[PDB]
Design a protein around this nucleic acid. Structure first.
Lengths: 428, 134, 96, 85
RNA sequence: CUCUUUAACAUUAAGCCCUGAAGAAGGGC
């Protein structure tokens, strides 16, 4: 057939190393060729081509996709033409037996050449990604060599390198060449012309792995850490738990008088650390992550899970902390929104929550005497939820269980339908 | 006492072996070749290094029946000394049960952290049934 | 090339020390080097002074451990491995 | 008894305005994290041991070597472009 | 010549002051 001498010299020059796959080259460039031949022919078709390493000549076959339907008559068949194959073909498999005219050109060489070097780029990047997969999420030490503005390049052995962005490093600390840096890598964003590893001391994974090296109980998988939240310069909160009840996880991580955690805090730049127990009840776990400051009143809205917290003043100021970040850490740990207030404002806040809505009820069906009473247990159900909750629940000795509930549902559902219709085609 | 003081040095060797997991001939040749302890006697020190045989594993199994915690969950540093103690208990039986065992709790005073010996002072009930001559 | 390596070890928390020592043995074993350790000395008492808020009119010593290992022959990979592992924090492993 | 937060001192100073706003409103709110913000990926790292990692360090020697090979051979195709003069 | 089966309790701090209810934003030194 055909074989551009230049391109053959190219594939034998950029020939893949023993670690690398030379075959992959042909797999790519034949896709390139076949795509070019496909672009030549006026009708949209599917086409393949194959080359052998021994010769360099290729052969181009235009093929159809056996299918049970009529779309793309240029590329479809039935099992009847597969009778030429002796019924060996099945649907969803595309085969044929007729070669097509193999294309020769010069401009293709260029783009063909491109694919070669193109694959090489991916070859570099991909070849590096292996090492990342080998050490993804682990702490590795390097020695700084460059100090670019707000990011530093670190040398690792065996021609390996890395980089730390300023967001990934401590807020206070600036580094210099020659300083050893312990750092967990966490991403490999593909820069143009290959990628390079990204390392971080600021991310929580630095802290978690920093605890893994320190507490063998986690290394022994005895105890699990369920989440970690941290403010790099200041403090951190971490939730631990074991289901064995054999040992205390917080005691295992703390060490002797804190000497096991303080050590990591020494590596973390003296960052304050709160170790708390992990809990499966959200609310209780929230209280545990709310520590050192703690409250006795908790309200939840699992529909939004934006729960609220109330507390004495002296413990209020402790609950918020500097700039609020205390709660911000707790929420950051809980993976859920939070809200803090004073208890005195809390009770009245619930009475207002119920009062405005009860003014809506009085605004719709108007029996303020009957509604305020129904409001007492309405708290579980919004005006839509009363209609959405099964009627099995709201039946009580108070009020009328059977005659009034039907009309109630009618009123509520009609009104909410009116709001839904007012969303669209409103004045403004 | 000074001869008894020899024993602990022998006690120290197996931990080495226990973590090096090498041929015992290497352990003895390198150990004595580096330095000689004039206080302890090799005449007796060498006989215990033979006791690496697994008969002492059979005796350590005797601790399994009653065990609040897993056999190997407890510190190997502290398990080694139990293999030694019961080596002398059944294979040797040189010192009586309460006399050897009180000293034994002192032995894990020497290297056991957080009163490890003191709680393991319960475990001596497991040793008593092997010899009713209390 | 400076084959007579000298290593001692301070050990404030035995739990980390057994594992740490075992790793220092595994790095020599995997490179191919063989050696004898840890040779533990008895527990050393280090008196402790504390300064808590004034009590009406506070630990003062905690148990420590100590180990020692050498190396028969460091392969070129054994120095990069020995420097390559990250010493468990809270324990001073200063080389002799 | 320092209590050296200027903004907190202002809070105690402006406490009456806070009381004026206290009625019939949310008092404080606190949102944090996000799914895209809270992926942590910490399921399993013990297979990689500090011995294994120290014994099998991150090696990219073959990549740089191969790279130099490529660049040399490309300069050789520019030698194909080159003429003897 | 028994002491009745192995600690865990860790955080000392980030200026002054203004607009703003805000511990949201934002400012002067």
């Amino acid at each position: 057939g055909a074989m551009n001498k230049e391109i053959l010299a190219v594939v034998e020059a950029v020939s893949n190393e023993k670690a690398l796959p030379r075959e992959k080259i042909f797999e790519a460039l034949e896709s390139a060729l076949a795509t070019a031949t496909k672009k030549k022919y006026e009708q949209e078709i599917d086409v393949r081509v194959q080359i052998d390493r021994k010769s360099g000549d290729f052969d181009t076959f235009r093929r159809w996709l056996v299918v049970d339907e009529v779309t793309q008559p240029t590329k479809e068949i039935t099992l009847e033409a597969a009778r030429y194959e002796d019924e060996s073909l099945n649907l969803g498999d595309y085969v044929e037996d007729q070669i097509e005219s193999v294309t020769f050109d010069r401009i293709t060489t260029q783009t063909a050449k491109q694919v070669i070097v193109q694959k090489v780029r991916e070859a570099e990047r991909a070849m590096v990604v292996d090492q990342f997969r080998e050490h993804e999420g682990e702490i590795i030490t390097g020695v700084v060599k460059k100090v670019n503005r707000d990011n530093i390049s670190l040398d690792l052995g065996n021609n390996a390198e890395a980089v730390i962005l300023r967001e990934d490093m401590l807020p206070r600390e600036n580094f210099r060449p020659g300083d050893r840096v312990r750092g967990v890598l966490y991403s490999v964003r593909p820069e143009a012309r290959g990628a390079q590893l990204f390392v971080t001391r600021s991310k929580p994974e630095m802290l978690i792995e920093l605890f893994r090296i320190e507490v063998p109980e986690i290394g022994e998988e005895v105890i699990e850490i369920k989440a970690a939240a941290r403010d790099p310069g200041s403090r951190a909160k971490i939730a631990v738990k074991t289901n064995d009840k054999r040992i205390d996880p917080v005691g295992a991580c703390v060490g002797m008088r804190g000497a096991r955690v303080q050590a990591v805090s020494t590596e973390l730049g003296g960052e304050r650390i709160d170790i708390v127990l992990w809990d499966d009840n959200p609310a209780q776990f929230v209280i545990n992550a709310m520590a050192p400051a703690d409250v006795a009143s908790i309200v939840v809205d699992e529909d939004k899970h934006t729960m609220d917290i109330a507390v004495e003043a002296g413990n209020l100021a402790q609950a918020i902390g500097r700039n609020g970040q205390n709660v911000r850490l707790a929420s950051q740990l809980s993976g859920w929104e939070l809200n803090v207030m004073t208890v005195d404002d809390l009770q009245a806040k619930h009475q207002a929550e119920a009062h405005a809505a009860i003014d809506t009820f009085t605004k719709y069906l108007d029996i303020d005497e009957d509604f305020a009473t129904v409001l007492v247990e309405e708290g579980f159900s919004t005006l839509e939820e009363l209609a959405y909750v099964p009627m099995k629940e709201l039946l009580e000795i108070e009020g009328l269980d059977e005659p009034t509930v039907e009309a109630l549902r009618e009123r509520a559902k009609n009104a909410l339908a009116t709001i839904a219709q007012a969303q669209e085609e409103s004045l403004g | 006492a000074a001869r008894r003081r020899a024993r602990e040095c022998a006690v120290q060797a197996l931990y080495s072996w226990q973590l090096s997991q090498n041929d015992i001939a290497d352990v003895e040749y390198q150990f004595l070749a580096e330095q000689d302890v004039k206080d302890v006697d090799v005449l007796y020190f060498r006989e215990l290094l033979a006791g690496v045989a697994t008969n002492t594993a059979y005796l350590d199994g005797l601790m399994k029946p009653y065990l609040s915690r897993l056999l190997e969950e407890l510190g190997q540093v502290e398990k080694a000394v139990l293999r030694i103690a019961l080596y002398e208990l059944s294979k040797r039986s040189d010192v009586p049960y309460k006399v050897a065992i009180n000293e034994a709790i002192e032995l894990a005073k020497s290297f056991g952290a957080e009163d490890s010996h003191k709680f393991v002072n319960g475990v001596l009930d497991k040793a008593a049934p092997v010899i009713r001559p209390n | 090339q400076n084959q007579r390596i000298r290593i001692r070890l301070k050990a404030f928390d035995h739990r980390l020390i057994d594992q740490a020592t075992a790793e220092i043995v595994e790095t020599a074993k995997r490179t191919g080097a063989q050696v004898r350790g840890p040779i533990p000395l008895p527990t050393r008492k280090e008196r402790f002074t504390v300064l808590i808020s004034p009590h009406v009119n506070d630990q003062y010593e905690i148990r420590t451990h100590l180990r020692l290992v050498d190396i028969v022959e460091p392969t070129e990979k054994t120095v990069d491995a020995l420097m390559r592992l990250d010493l468990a924090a809270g324990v001073d492993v200063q080389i002799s | 008894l320092g209590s050296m937060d200027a903004q907190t001192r202002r809070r105690e100073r402006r406490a009456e305005k806070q009381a004026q706003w206290k009625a019939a409103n949310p008092l404080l709110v606190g949102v944090s994290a996000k799914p895209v913000n809270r992926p942590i990926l910490s399921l399993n790292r013990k297979p990689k041991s500090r011995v294994e990692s120290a014994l099998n360090p991150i090696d990219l020697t073959v990549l740089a070597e191969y790279h130099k090979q490529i660049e040399s051979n490309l300069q050789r195709i520019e030698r194909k472009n080159q003429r003897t003069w």
